[PDB]
Design a protein around this ligand. Structure first.
Ligand SMILES: [Fe+3]
Ligand SMILES: [Fe+3]
Length: 647
């Protein structure tokens, strides 16, 4: 059930490898992943509350092109009507591993699978008993920002012999980054319980309390950016949010031949915040309730010279929402509040029936898994100001096929093709687009590639193909859906690791690694824009580094690097003056770190000092459509420290 045997583009990093790069936030761990692009805070998502991610040149603003899940539960506060992770109730420190799947997904996962299926694996409940705790502090000396950024995780839990267990997972953030007006406060509280009375029945549960607020720096005009890169010309922009998650799960397994699982989940999420929208400053609260019950049965049975693992599954989901918008003339110093004019009061919703079925077939050195997923989406929006009521319902057949060939006991070949569909979001109901109407978003992906492993050389490489019927943006500034039409995403994803010790003792416990990805994202639709590279899609993006482990020491050397990219569908090459429009530099950065594991016994106490961007080279990223569009100063040389304690 673990990757090397995946008939597709897949990568999964484990906890024991987050520290490697001084990583402390989802973003940072995913950006090492090939073909994955995860920009530093910028725009609406200008804070550590939101998550920005995208693969294969797909727009990574607020991850809306993917299916991100924590323990199978959907992270979003609408996975249908508002995929955008303005708020991302999730903390790296509470996870034991990140599983990013670019292709060949069980068709258990969807609908918006086209942009990859990212699932976060919350830390395992300890066997008998335990306590882990860790921290990391970061500083950007060369910034006018002196207060540092601390983060920390705490783990307490265990399992009584009666077959019951519980873990209290905690993760939180305090501090500001290298930009003024970035003061963040995050508190992610989780209560993970499990119950295995025997060996057939098992019950699991998950309760979560994520509360958070942050000051958004936002972008800069050029004048201001050169004047002082650290400063921020957006003093009103703020963002805060809290999520409450509850999930109950039970699995019936009488033998290793059949398996029944059923998971239910409820999550209430509220996110709102201050923002400056042209001579008006707005308070925008948005609540979301999301129910979901999901049963699925599996069975293994042989047929002729073939092994069959039929997987069946269902998922009913219900998402009701409420979003309002209070506003005030910026000319005043006054920030908006309740009892203040509101120009937007609505209630949207959706009821989605999904069905999926696949059949893993084994035969010789072949594993063919022909599957199909089907969704019946019904979404409605109710404007309380206009009174106008709208509705939507589309059916989405989703064929899928995976084939894996076993060349050797250490080399596999694979190929696949799965599809997706994005139901019209509540933010697109009034389909005011130039080419008729908005959505849906139908896409298909094709992957071809190989994976190799031999205990000294571990590598992979694959080619992909993604066809998009259309793609729409947002332009929060004016509240209008700028389209893009059809696009075709093609490229190659590769990475490798090696034990430079199996060549000579002198390099014993030395390891070098590198990943790379070439991505060609282009517009294929109608007019003026045809033939253009999609915005924010470096063609070239990868990493390279080395790991040395003499005794309990750990020495990490690594570099990041990426080509240039455009901000608009126009492909404008000259900076716009506000800083939004404009080609964007590529760059290569260098980072290192030194850690020691004080007596793997004692208290597994670990310490480590590391520098980020040793050369303090300069770079930046633009935000084009967000109300705070501008130049976002790139992370400068950062000195950080980590500390782990286990009991
Ligand atoms: Fe927004
Ligand atoms: Fe908006």
């Amino acid at each position: 059930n673990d990757v090397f045997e995946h008939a597709g583009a897949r990568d999964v990093i484990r906890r024991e490898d987050f520290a490697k790069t001084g990583a402390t936030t989802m973003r940072e761990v995913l950006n090492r992943i090939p073909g994955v692009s995860a920009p530093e805070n910028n725009g609406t998502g200008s804070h550590d509350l939101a998550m920005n991610f995208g693969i294969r040149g797909l727009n990574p603003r607020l991850a809306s092109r993917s299916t991100v899940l924590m323990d199978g539960i959907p992270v979003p506060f609408a996975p249908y009507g508002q995929p955008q992770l303005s708020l991302a109730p999730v903390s790296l420190g509470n996870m034991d591993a990140i599983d990013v799947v670019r292709g060949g997904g069980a068709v258990r996962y969807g609908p918006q699978s086209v942009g990859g299926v990212v699932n976060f694996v919350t830390r395992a409940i300890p066997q008998d008993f335990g306590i882990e705790a860790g921290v990391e502090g970061q500083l950007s000396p060369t910034s006018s920002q002196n207060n540092p950024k601390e983060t920390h995780n705490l783990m307490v839990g265990g399992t009584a012999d009666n077959g019951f267990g519980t873990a209290l997972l905690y993760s939180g953030t305090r501090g500001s980054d290298w930009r003024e007006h970035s003061a963040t406060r995050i508190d992610d509280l989780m209560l993970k319980s499990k119950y295995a009375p025997d060996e057939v029945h098992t019950f699991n549960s998950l309760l979560q309390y994520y509360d958070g607020e942050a000051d958004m720096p936002g972008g800069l005009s050029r004048a201001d950016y050169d004047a002082d890169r650290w400063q921020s010309t957006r003093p009103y922009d703020r963002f805060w949010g809290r999520r409450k998650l509850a999930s109950l799960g039970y699995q019936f397994q009488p033998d290793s031949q059949h398996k029944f699982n059923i998971q239910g989940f409820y999550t209430q999420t509220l996110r709102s915040g201050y923002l400056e929208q042209g001579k008006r400053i707005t308070l925008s609260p948005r609540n979301y309730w999301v129910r979901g019950i999901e049963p699925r049965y599996s069975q293994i049975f042989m047929i002729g010279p073939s092994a069959h693992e039929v997987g069946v599954g269902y998922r009913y989901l219900n998402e009701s929402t409420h979003e309002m918008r209070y506003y005030t003339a910026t000319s005043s110093g006054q920030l908006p509040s309740g009892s203040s004019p509101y120009d937007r009061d609505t209630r949207s919703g959706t009821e989605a029936h999904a069905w999926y079925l696949d059949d893993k077939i084994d035969i010789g050195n072949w594993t063919i898994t022909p599957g199909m997923r089907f969704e019946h989406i019904e979404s409605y929006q109710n404007n309380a100001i206009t009174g106008t009521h709208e509705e939507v319902s589309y059916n989405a057949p989703l064929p899928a096929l995976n084939v894996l060939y076993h060349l050797t006991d250490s080399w596999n070949l694979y190929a696949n093709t799965e599809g997706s569909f994005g139901t019209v979001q509540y933010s697109q109901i009034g389909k005011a687009v130039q080419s008729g109407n908005v959505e849906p978003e139908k896409a298909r992906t094709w992957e071809l590639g190989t994976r190799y492993d031999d205990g000294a050389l571990t590598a992979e490489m694959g080619l992909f193909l993604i066809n998009f019927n259309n793609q729409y943006d947002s332009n929060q500034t004016n509240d209008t859906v700028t389209a893009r039409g059809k696009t075709r995403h093609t490229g190659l994803e590769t990475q490798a690791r090696y034990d430079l010790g199996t060549l000579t003792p002198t390099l014993d416990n030395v390891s070098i690694y590198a990943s790379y990805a070439y991505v060609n994202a282009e517009i294929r639709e109608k007019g003026d824009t045809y033939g253009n590279l999609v915005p924010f899609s470096p063609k070239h993006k990868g990493t390279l580094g080395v790991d040395y482990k003499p005794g309990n020491w750990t020495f990490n050397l690594n570099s990041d690097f990426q080509s240039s990219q455009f901000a608009d569908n126009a492909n404008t090459v000259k900076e716009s003056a506000d800083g939004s429009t404009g080609r964007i530099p590529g760059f290569m950065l260098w980072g290192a770190r030194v850690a020691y594991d004080f007596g793997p016994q004692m208290a597994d106490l670990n310490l480590a000092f590391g520098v980020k961007n040793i050369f303090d080279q300069d770079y930046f990223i633009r935000s084009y459509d967000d109300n705070n569009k501008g130049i976002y100063a790139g992370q400068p040389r950062t000195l950080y420290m980590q500390g782990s304690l286990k009991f």
